[PDB]
Amino acid sequence: TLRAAVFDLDGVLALPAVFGVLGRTEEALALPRGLLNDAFQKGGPEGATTRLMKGEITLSQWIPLMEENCRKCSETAKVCLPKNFSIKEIFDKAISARKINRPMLQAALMLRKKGFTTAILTNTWLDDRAERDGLAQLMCELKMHFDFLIESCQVGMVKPEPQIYKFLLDTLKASPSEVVFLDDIGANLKPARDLGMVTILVQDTDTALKELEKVTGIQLLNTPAPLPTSCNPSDMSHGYVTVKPRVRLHFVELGSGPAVCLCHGFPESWYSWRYQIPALAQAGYRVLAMDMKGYGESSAPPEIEEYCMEVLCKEMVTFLDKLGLSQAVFIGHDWGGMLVWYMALFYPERVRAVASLNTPFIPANPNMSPLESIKANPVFDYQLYFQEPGVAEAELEQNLSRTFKSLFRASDESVLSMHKVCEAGGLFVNSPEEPSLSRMVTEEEIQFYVQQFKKSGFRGPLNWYRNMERNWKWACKSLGRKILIPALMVTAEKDFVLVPQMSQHMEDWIPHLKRGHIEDCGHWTQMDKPTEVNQILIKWLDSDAR
Amino acid sequence: TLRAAVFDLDGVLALPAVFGVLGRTEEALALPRGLLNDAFQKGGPEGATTRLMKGEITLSQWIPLMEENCRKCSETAKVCLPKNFSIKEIFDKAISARKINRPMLQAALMLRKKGFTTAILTNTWLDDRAERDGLAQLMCELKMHFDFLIESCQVGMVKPEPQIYKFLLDTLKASPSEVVFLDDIGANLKPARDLGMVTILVQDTDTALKELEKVTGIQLLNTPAPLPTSCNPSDMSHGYVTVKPRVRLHFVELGSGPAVCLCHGFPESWYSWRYQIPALAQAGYRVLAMDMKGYGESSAPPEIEEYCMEVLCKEMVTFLDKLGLSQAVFIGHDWGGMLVWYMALFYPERVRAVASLNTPFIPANPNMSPLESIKANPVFDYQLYFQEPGVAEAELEQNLSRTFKSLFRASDESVLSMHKVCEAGGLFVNSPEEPSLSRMVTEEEIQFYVQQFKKSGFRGPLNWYRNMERNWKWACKSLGRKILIPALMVTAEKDFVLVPQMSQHMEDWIPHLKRGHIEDCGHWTQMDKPTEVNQILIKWLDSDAR
């Protein structure tokens, strides 16, 4: 019975194969068929290419050796190589054109999700070319999805030498009959078969995956669309910045490029952005996913006034100062979305661009008390229930697992009616003791939130709602301003509190506002519709924040 | 007696003043004298500029109001504004041309170093222009050097209104006679004087500083060249990455731009790069200053083999993987310098560029044992003393303050002769019990190293020297390679162990090697000659790593 799957890189996990560009070049330049492929393999196990593949020499040292082999091959074939013939140019173009074979990667992801140990076994080189970063990026993206990456140039062994196969088996800690081995080179497949491994000769991906699903008994072809890559908290880089004597802010950091600061809502975590963090980093951004003040590993002082927007915004500016960032793009959801609009209004020089999920920008009404304003909308009743210190803390902290399971539900699963909460005497008074698990979350993800909230509970988080008057007075100072930096508003069709229509007048304050809209999406945008959030945010970042 | 100094931004800490470009524009366009300056101040306290300076409106909203004022002023003066007249272009150019007034900043730094509370008090605006990042960067650099930054647009008060002066005094927690106030606008200086503050009208910097040093009694002009900005550990962003189950790596992070990974030597810390971190970040780089394995907040497993180059390099690759970085420029010193050459040889695709301070690249000799090789050079005797587990730990851990004070000394201060250490029976056997403090370090900096080493001591650090055979076998695999990625070798004239001549054959292995050389510099390069290290590294990064 199979428990391990091994994939080659060239022509398997990455296409078009770098091999076959030698063939493609021969055709375009009308060179004798196989001339370049022959110069490539010249000298066989003692040749320059084997030395390269074993890590004896680097790719830049190999280039002139390949050029000498091409000359010797053309001389024997009694032909001439063109005037501007360059091995470097040919290989630069082939490497740059080779991209991840997405359905092969998805199949490897599914097998690993089912308990398989997965590995990449590849004949590759030490890349010291000026354009090596492209291949470094491809390898980084691919490797994270596998248990092991075995590279010929690092192990000093090459396929089809029998030793690399014994080395593979030793690293997998598996007997050969327990292994599926996928390769596009028949000669490299032979020693694995000889050892008793299941082998698949990959020509076209679909046929290879049909063979792969038949032998494993796992559906790999025609599957439902997978969710984006999530985060394993223990595999993240965790950052900590003291913004003032008693306040430290924690964040998770991934990627390179323009800084993108993600600001969660209530009662959430940096982890609410788990589906966005890998996607935004892969899109070419340096992601900083915060634990907002009062949450997770960030400090949670008890005083109400520590959570007014003016103080929270000043602390986020200090956070940027201490990290040495002149700007960040700020993306927020729920309370985080309110904070990001205030960052845009009060600190535009520090905000590269601003985006909000669900939370609209509604200017303060200077002729009405914020308390009156909340009372005017029945769906805001939960905010009145949150006012009295201790009442909501008691209900939310009583049973953490029940709190998160009752809250984190898709539009067609909810049991919480945020209107008439005060009258009912609680958020969960008509909710079960043991809620069913929403299709949006796993038991493990719920337990992560439970563990995070065991540190500080709900006082700090609820305090975000307890500064209405203070926030109103501060917001009134901005009533003559417009938001003129790049801005995105993302509405969720089925958020029954932060309804899309509440955003209808935003263009009066943000004339250049761009929009996104997610159908069949509830309040928990990031986890409800992660694929669609990622598509909207990446498209907007690439056009407006780059 | 004075205890606080307050500086204006425009025309004081930053030059040329944005004011006076209105005058400069009038002259270049042959407009009536003062036309632009009049449109700028139109309506006085009720005018558009005061509204801008109080934060009522943003700079982008103010631009067309200034354009309307210019039209009204030209109409009254019976003149016409040119065809391509643009307030936006004029202000973009003026803001971009304004740079920090370095001697004014140095004077503020010296006063603060002497116990003064320093502040910037400025009439400024909320900048939402597409090019706002330039001013955001300038403000970030300046603000870090002061106790307070008071901006008119954030406080809703403007100079010369008497309220902003009372607000200044309240924030300084000082009586007016205790305050020096420097401004380039005489009208803005008047309320401070009226309150009893010492005031200086800044026209040219030299005269202003003569006035400033006369009134404070502190030398500010003609001073010795200051050291670069250092790091306060508690003000840094601290990052933590688990690279394998029992190993976490700690780093300090500052700046945006290409990742630059700094790798310290023995027995050091991320803090040994304290003078480089702010300078490299200000130069446009994202600095990652490591605590190498075995040090500070990084894990220190006891096993010797956890510290061989192959494992240390694999862990640094995993560190990059977990942070989502396809590459970093690697800069190392002493053992860190040896590691960075090995990163360049084994993982060129992950190394953007490589630089070493003091440590030369010497290929492994496959015909001589590494033990024999160390024995051949008398200055390497300390490495033999470090071999026996427990001997050097006992001597180095006996008195931490004595260890760091004996080690960290300039070339003209040393008491340690690294030849005949085994014979003498120790590194400090002819060193005092209470060494004098080197001119390179403060007591506080020594105590930081003492506190860091209290966690794990010297086992992990000494283990870096205990893998000679393992490192030799691994290095022999790279004997057919050349380092062909961008590389810099920095020699220190007076390092008597890592002598400059030991680097003489490096071009045979690194043909495109660039060099730097520091005269009158001992082993502790970064702290011995920080200004010169910063100049060499920034020049090289900007030409070879950008």
Ligand SMILES: Cc1ccc2c(c1)SCC(=O)N2
């Ligand atoms: C805290 C919170 C705020 C708004 C919400 C929810 C929860 S779920 C129900 C919903 O649609 N909106």
Ligand SMILES: Cc1ccc2c(c1)SCC(=O)N2
């Ligand atoms: C650990 C260490 C290595 C080399 C050194 C020193 C210290 S100080 C004396 C010197 O010049 N070289």
